Nucleic acid binder design. Structure first.
Lengths: 148, 52, 222, 58, 185, 49
RNA sequence: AUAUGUAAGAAGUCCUUGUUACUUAAUUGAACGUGGACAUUUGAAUGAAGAGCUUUUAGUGGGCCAUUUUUGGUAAGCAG
RNA sequence: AUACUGCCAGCUGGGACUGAGGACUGCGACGUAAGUCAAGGAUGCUGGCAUAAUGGUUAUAUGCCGCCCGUCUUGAAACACGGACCAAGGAGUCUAACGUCUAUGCGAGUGUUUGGGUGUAAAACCCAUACGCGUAAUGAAAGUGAACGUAGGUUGGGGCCUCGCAAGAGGUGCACAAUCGACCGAUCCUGAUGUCUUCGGAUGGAUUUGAGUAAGAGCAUAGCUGUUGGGACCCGAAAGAU
RNA sequence: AAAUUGUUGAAAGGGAAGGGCAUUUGAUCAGACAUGGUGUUUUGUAUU
């Protein structure tokens, strides 16, 4: 849409919207992040604090495959169970028929107890569990059994 | 809405059979959506040019 | 519903009753003005006969006309002129006389001509140039119906009631004056009477407090 | 090639364009910077007041 | 000349005739302009301006939020009116039997409404069944809970989510953010 | 060079990328050629899967 | 003298001290609050052209000249 | 009586410019009532030509005025710079990654188009996966990981719920704003049952601290404007190297 | 095509020319009176 640009509206005006006193020169302040500590220090300190320096330790050959662990909350777990049977278990909440939820199969490595699952017993299968998640699951009546 | 639509036969004015509307004809008319999508797909059918 | 006979008759009867009460109010106002003027005269004569001096009560109302342009004016006088609604040259406004308003006038002395108007000039200004501030719009008064519709809560039901409040400043003078849009006067028809305007009226100029000559000045300007 | 060093010209006008309007005030100002002993006491007193008010209007 | 106090030829500063080219949105705007003009209902006026509203100013409102609005005392039977999109919340396991009027419904949200037993209606049905907005309750979504607003107003000692691309160690967590490295913000 | 509140960008374009640009105008042609080669190999090994 | 900080109330004024891990010799104070009383003079004037608020970005970052105050200089269409 | 001043909703006269505007309306005035008016904007009557006569254009003449444009500049007509003239060409573009806003689609999801299928063979149409972003944050990290309450209390709040023909209040209050809290990481504390003889910190805290929670709001496409690297709005070095 | 030239010709001319406002003079030109009007003395009264 080059016909909508302000370049078409600046046709006829001398400076093309760049000013007559301070012209549109090539690189009046530097190139890129030039002078972030000298003359752009004000911008860096105002808007990007912590830009300069190093803090943590290094980790040669880091692997996001090692660090893969998506988290799942308890409400998201009860919605992770399929709906057309979710209605059935929610109505017929009882033991000896509690659904088994494989958070690992769903793609979650950890479960977190963000609050207020119904009182339906349910067997939970997760790689890692949280203290509050386990307490809330047991209060609901189910259990969390560890897998790998 | 629209009850039925007849079928035109090559051997006369029409025939006895008629069918209802698939509701794709009842789907909303969005000229702006059609305009944007058509602009984009008409751009999709294109070829590249450049100077030496 | 014809809305030709019954509605018209009811509206015309209400209008006639309102006109009668307006006429009664105007007669009362004229009697009050005449009584006040004659009483002032007899008070002066009685003081002279008794050997004492009758000091005139300081006038409770002034008319102030901004007569200087809108260029090269310092911030404090500019703000005081804006507060008194004097945003154009040859622009007038009625002011109730108090310590605060007198200090404002003393502040804006070199840009306005102000003085003590009489009933004649007040009536002249209201009748000739009377515009209400309705919905932030300058509509001409032109109708006791309009004045009553916009000031009936205060009992002002006609241009005569508005003029009466203005001349005999009362409980609702602030509301009536704010309803009155600032007067846009022309230049004086016979001239300003002085070669140079921007000296004090005392010094042979035109600005400042011309006490009772504001009547002549505003009648020439209106 | 000397130049003008400093001036306050036009500064008040620039301020008063959309300037010196007063800051907005609030009921219940921030309790930061006040004595932390008073803060602890006010916290406990507010908790007790809320409990007593709920008891009064159950 | 006039010594102007305010700025001359200043636009309203508000929105009218929404930027959307949707002919159906224009139809709804026409209907509610007529309603607001000839009804005097503040509900009609506010629904008209909410129709004028833009997208980020019309955040999605969840069925959980509607359920909370109905759990409000004496509001169980009020028609819940939202000018925008109603989304389905998977964090609630119960819904009441309310009537919801809205511009748009997600598939899950509409299914939730009709499974709970209520009706999903549009703004024109809301107008036809309640011209003055009788027994209505207007719902609004959280406008100030997005990435843009969390970045807005960034500066020293504000704590307003610095505009960054990569998040983690050695990405703006250094001099100017801890006392051990120079100063702290 | 730096300006108002914006994310710090790392655009690695300080080499002769304009010489090293590859634009895949031949997506459709490559797909057609791959399907044609699959068909030809199937014909060549006609009973084999 | 001119400039300049405040205040001119409803987020206010008066009986119940209800809570407290603060404070007091002490149900003494402090803070917050529940119950009650105060309308067309809700506590000066004038005005208000709609208050208030957020985002984003341009140009600019050589200035100069009156009237007053004023510095260096004999002075300057000098410099500040 | 009369220099004077003030008032008259006092009485007459002579000039000028203007004539905006609608299918019933308004406000008014005028003899004891028919209706007429100068009352919400010009009508009535009468003349000359049925044309360059009025006018438009144009060239002179006359009265007054009028310095050569662009640029740098506090200041240009400048004794500052470019411009003898004319034709054609001639300078904020495209890309990668993005910020704000807007429109659109779907929505706790979103994106078909790396590929595969089929095709009227670079269109179009269709497709079990994965992946990117979002749904969880915090710490350097090991790690831990978001409801003690109707997802809280107070203040203000648009909107919505009655007695309601003169002045008249409560209830609910979800955008958002201010404040006091609660919860999740980090720091500093405290430390009960139990001991792979020294280990997990249950609980209770702290003028500390986080780009958090506290009934999701994002993803994708496109469009002004703005950012960065690229030749980078166009033209321009003295140079350096092979 | 323009710059730049020669010639139908027209006007101007006391050390520039060009321009604005306003008329005058000369040259040139559009608009407008068969338009939707009289019922019968002129007619080329299904054409009015």
């Amino acid at each position: 849409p080059s016909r909508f640009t302000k370049t078409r509206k600046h046709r006829g005006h001398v400076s093309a919207g760049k000013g007559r006193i301070g012209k549109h020169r090539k690189h009046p302040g530097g190139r890129g992040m030039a002078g972030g500590q000298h003359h752009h220090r004000i911008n860096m300190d105002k808007y990007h604090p912590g830009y300069f320096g190093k803090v943590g330790m290094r980790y040669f050959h880091k692997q996001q495959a090692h660090f893969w662990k998506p988290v799942l909350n308890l409400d998201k777990l009860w919605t992770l169970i399929p709906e057309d049977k979710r209605d059935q278990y929610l109505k017929s909440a009882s033991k000896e028929t509690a659904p088994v939820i494989d958070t690992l199969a769903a793609g979650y490595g950890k479960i977190l107890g963000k609050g207020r699952i119904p009182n339906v017993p349910v067997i939970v299968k997760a790689r890692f569990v949280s203290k509050l998640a386990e307490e809330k699951i047991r209060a609901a009546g189910g259990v969390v059994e560890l897998i790998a | 809405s629209r009850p039925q639509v007849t079928v035109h036969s090559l051997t006369g004015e029409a025939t006895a059979n008629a069918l209802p509307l698939p509701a794709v004809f009842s789907a909303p008319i969005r000229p702006d959506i059609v305009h944007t999508v058509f602009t984009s797909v008409n751009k999709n059918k294109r070829q590249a040019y450049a100077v030496s | 519903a014809e809305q030709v006979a019954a509605e018209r008759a009811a509206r015309k009867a209400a209008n006639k009753e309102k006109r009668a009460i307006i006429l009664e109010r105007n007669a009362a106002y004229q009697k009050e003005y005449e009584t006040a003027e004659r009483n002032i005269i007899q008070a002066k004569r009685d003081a002279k006969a008794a050997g004492s001096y009758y000091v005139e009560a300081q006038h409770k109302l002034v008319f102030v006309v901004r007569i200087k342009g809108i260029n090269k004016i310092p911030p404090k006088p500019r703000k005081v002129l804006q507060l008194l609604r004097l945003t154009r040259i040859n622009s007038g406004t009625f002011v109730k006389v108090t310590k605060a308003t007198l200090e404002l006038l003393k502040l804006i002395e070199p840009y306005v001509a102000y003085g003590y108007p009489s009933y004649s000039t007040i009536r002249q200004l209201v009748y000739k140039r009377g515009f209400g501030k309705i919905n932030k719009q300058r509509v001409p008064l032109s109708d006791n119906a309009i004045i009553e519709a916009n000031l009936g809560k205060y009992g002002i039901l006609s241009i005569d009631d508005l003029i009466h409040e203005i001349i005999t400043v009362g409980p609702h003078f602030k509301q009536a004056n704010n309803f009155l849009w600032p007067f846009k006067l022309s230049n004086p028809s016979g001239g300003w009477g002085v070669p140079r305007k921007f000296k004090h009226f005392i010094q042979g100029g035109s600005f400042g407090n011309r006490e009772e000559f504001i009547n002549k000045l505003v009648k020439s300007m209106n | 090639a000397k130049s003008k060093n400093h001036t306050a010209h036009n500064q008040t006008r620039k301020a008063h364009r959309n300037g010196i309007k007063k800051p907005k005030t609030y009921k219940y100002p921030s309790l930061k910077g006040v004595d932390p002993k008073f803060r602890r006491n006010h916290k406990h007193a507010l908790h007790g007041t809320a409990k007593a008010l709920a008891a009064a209007k159950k | 000349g006039i010594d102007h106090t305010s700025k001359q030829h200043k636009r309203s500063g508000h929105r009218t005739a929404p930027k959307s080219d949707n002919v159906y949105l224009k139809l709804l705007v026409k209907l509610y302009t007529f309603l607001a003009r000839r009804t005097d209902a503040p509900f009609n006026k506010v629904v008209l301006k909410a129709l004028f509203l833009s997208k980020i100013n019309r955040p999605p409102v969840s069925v959980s939020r509607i359920a909370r609005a109905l759990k409000q005392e004496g509001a169980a039977n009020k028609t819940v009116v939202v000018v925008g999109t109603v989304t389905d919340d998977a964090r609630i396991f119960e819904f009441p039997k309310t009537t919801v009027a809205a511009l748009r419904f997600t598939a899950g949200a509409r299914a939730k409404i009709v499974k709970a037993g209520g009706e999903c209606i549009t703004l024109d049905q809301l107008a036809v069944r309640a011209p003055k907005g009788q027994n209505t309750l207007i719902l609004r979504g959280p406008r100030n809970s997005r990435e843009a607003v969390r970045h807005f107003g960034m500066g020293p000692h504000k704590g307003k989510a610095p505009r960054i691309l990569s998040t983690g160690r050695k990405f703006e967590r250094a001099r100017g953010r801890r006392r051990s490295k120079g100063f702290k913000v | 060079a730096i300006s108002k509140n914006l994310p710090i960008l790392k655009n690695h374009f300080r080499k002769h990328w304009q010489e090293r640009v590859k634009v895949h105008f031949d997506q459709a042609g490559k797909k057609v050629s791959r399907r044609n080669a699959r068909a030809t190999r199937a014909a060549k090994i006609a009973p084999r899967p």
